[PDB]
Amino acid sequence: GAPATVTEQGEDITSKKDRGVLKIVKRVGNGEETPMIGDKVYVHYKGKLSNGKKFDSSHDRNEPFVFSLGKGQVIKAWDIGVATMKKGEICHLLCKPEYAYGSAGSLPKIPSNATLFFEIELLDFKGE
């Protein structure tokens, strides 16, 4: 399935090149510009655990997730991954725990030491 495919066929987008965040571009977005640090970014997403459970989805909530890029308001994999996206892009990210919730996990949804899969669509980005 898609998690296996990005595990086996994804590109390492980390600065350390430690394969902690792998990416596949599923739909090419618009132009060449990616957001900048501090931009308000709007995304749709779904997240799955490595046991197949869907732990989160903005689509199911009927509202996007909104955060300021590069500020640690989301897991490290999202700060790094969304920073690579163009407006309108859809990507898959495969995130080792060191770029996600680590040994702590995040109750009730996410166990300790969890590798996570996301599908993310960058809807918009704007400076404030």
Is 118 noted as a catalytic residue in this protein? Answer: yes
Choice among 13, 65, 67, 75 that is catalytic:
75
Supply the CATH number for residue 125's domain: 3.10.50.40
Handedness of CA 105, 85, 47, 63 (dihedral sign): positive
CB burial class (10 A; 0-12, 13-18, 19+) of residue 92?
A: buried
Domain count, the chain: 1
Which of the following is catalytic: 12, 56, 90, 124? 56
Q: What are phi and psi of 57, to 5 degrees?
A: -165, 120
Q: Determination technique for this PDB entry?
A: X-ray
Structural domain span for residue 2: 1-128
- Burial class of residue 103, CB neighbours in 10 A (0-12, 13-18, 19+): exposed
Residue reference for tokens 């680590």 = 102
Residue from 90, 110, 108, 103 nearest 2 by CA: 90
> Which pair of tokens denotes residue 125?
């980005």
